[PDB]
Symmetry: C3
Amino acid sequence: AVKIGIIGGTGLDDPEILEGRTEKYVDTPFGKPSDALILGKIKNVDCVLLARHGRQHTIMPSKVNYQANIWALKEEGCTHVIVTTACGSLREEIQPGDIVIIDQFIDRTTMRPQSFYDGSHSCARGVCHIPMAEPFCPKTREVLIETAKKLGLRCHSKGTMVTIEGPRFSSRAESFMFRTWGADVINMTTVPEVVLAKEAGICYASIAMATDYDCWAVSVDRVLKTLKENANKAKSLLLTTIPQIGSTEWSETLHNLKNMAQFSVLLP
Amino acid sequence: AVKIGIIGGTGLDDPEILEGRTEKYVDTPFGKPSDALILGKIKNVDCVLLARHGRQHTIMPSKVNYQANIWALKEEGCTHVIVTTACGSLREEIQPGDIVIIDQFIDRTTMRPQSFYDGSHSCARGVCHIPMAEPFCPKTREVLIETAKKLGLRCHSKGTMVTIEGPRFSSRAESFMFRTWGADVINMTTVPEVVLAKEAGICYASIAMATDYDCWAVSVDRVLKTLKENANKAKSLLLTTIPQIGSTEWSETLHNLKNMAQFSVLLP
Amino acid sequence: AVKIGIIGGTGLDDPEILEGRTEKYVDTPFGKPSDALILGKIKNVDCVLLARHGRQHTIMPSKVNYQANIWALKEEGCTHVIVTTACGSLREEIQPGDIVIIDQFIDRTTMRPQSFYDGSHSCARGVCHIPMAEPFCPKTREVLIETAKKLGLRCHSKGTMVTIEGPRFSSRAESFMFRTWGADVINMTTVPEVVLAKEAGICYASIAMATDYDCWAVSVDRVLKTLKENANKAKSLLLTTIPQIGSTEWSETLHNLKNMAQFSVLLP
Ligand SMILES: Nc1ncnc2[nH]cnc12
Ligand SMILES: Nc1ncnc2[nH]cnc12
Ligand SMILES: Nc1ncnc2[nH]cnc12
């Protein structure tokens, strides 16, 4: 049995995607999640939706409680966590409106807790050095890619996301530099969300939606406009992907993830 | 009517530049500014001078209250903010003593608040994603460049400033790396000063004075020596530039800046 | 007379290396050191050993009190501080088990105090801008290199260490990027340890032990395994190097270090 946690980004957190909805506020050892958890289903698969920035988008990327969000979904019994996020394109071929099933990231954040094992919580004892060679679940990404193809959507099979601290957008010099580093898209929320999901032994995948070409220009109005015009794509992709995830066996994949997380912890 | 805020850097914060001076200590929602505001004039133009590190230079770059400084100048009615800063040269052609009217930056800071919209101040509500494609005012930079030419000063028309966290200087490996990234000069204070000025809808420009070639070596004594030998240049440039700024119309430029800042804010 | 401070890293902090041991808990203006100081000798040379992560390895890299550790050793009268650290190799020629006498670093840390002069301690007044062109002591590194040769150990004479914040390991995209930046090895503790030692006017050198090839894959178990298999190398190197350090004159080298540190401080 699988359970899909869904974290919705800016303008990509529609509750109506779930059938048989029930609101549920929870608490965690790391604090309160961005907003209430929305329990429901897509066909016969159980899901838990959560708005990353709150339903009214009042939380900036740097202040999102990534620890509480991931811990809450883990506590609900989620086996997978598929998220949505807007991003700027750093490559001509990645056009606004395109979907990118990212497989790598480059961290440019500075003031964000990236581990549950901070030495101050009894629920997470020891020092954890989680491997990040392959940050996103290959199997989950594969289903997303094939479903996008079945839907006939413009979708890139891989891509490197550079996550900046924000809330400001990048300068032109920074934008050029990121391209030379090998970054393909840019956002403000992938890190540490992907890191914490790995520590939790959860299958994590991200649906990145290009909304602009950054400035190599971007603005909040441009981002919001493109999201409004393309939100249906992420919704259709999730609706079609999830029942497919639920029809396959994940015990082995989840076992390997649990082992990796478990053996990354150094106890006294 | 224009009003020029002037933020003086290390050894480039001479109060005598202003005529008819009056000291004024102020407070802001973000705390106290580095020191008192010095009100005065250059010809018929009103100005407000502020020492970035305090008159006795007791504040390190990472602890400067950039938010309070910019907010105080904005509250005084400043339409422009022209600053001075020492920097290391990362290019052979930029010689110590040279002035660089920088047009871009690369952020290497880590523990600095970069927005007024942090969710804890009623004076700045919402999430702000300010555009940084063109961080510095083109029109203000243009006047500085032409005035430098009229004065016959060695001045570079553009340049990318990499702002490091400090207080330590860069290692040789870091110095080499910054050159490959496309950085031309290096300092410790441009970011987030330039970011906050943009959020405030103020025309911001920076007079960077090269004092050394970093280590691709630099020392505090070398920096102080070069500043003492060349401080008169920044003073003469400001004295000649400001009356020129005051003789032109800025309502349209300021309107466009206000619009950009206003529409960068996401309200609940 | 010399006194060698030794900071032992993960699995490279064996107390038995010292003869005539005596445990000593101390306090500093910056807080408590990672663990108690172990006083003792190697031949006729006085030494002070300190486990970076605590004897039971309960402190993550980002939470190590680098300020207290360096201050404690300085207060004990240490003239030199030679440390050990595990690291990942970013170059084919640097094989796991190899020693690298690093000479440069690239900072990728974000939430770490890098100076004693933070404006809140009477023991360290003013603003300090310490030079980092040559972060490690050349003379100390030279003795380590020659001793490694006399022992017939695979040892690299130089290398650039990129210090990441951690506790997570790097992503593959980050690993590739670090190689293009010119990094040779990667760890989580060199910065700011090397910076604070310089401010303290102490001769600092690092014995980096490659334990894996990062992911250009690494895991805690792989790291621990390689350290267990090669720990004897660092121990033998220290035992043979230290008596050699004690047989030479260091007054001039220490005087030059004291001058550099002293003149890096800007007083009110
Ligand atoms: N260009 C951009 N930079 C950062 N985050 C973004 N989100 C959407 N577009 C973005
Ligand atoms: N080389 C340098 N690095 C950083 N800040 C500086 N200010 C002056 N020279 C500098
Ligand atoms: N690959 C690696 N990255 C960071 N720290 C390490 N310590 C040992 N191997 C490492």
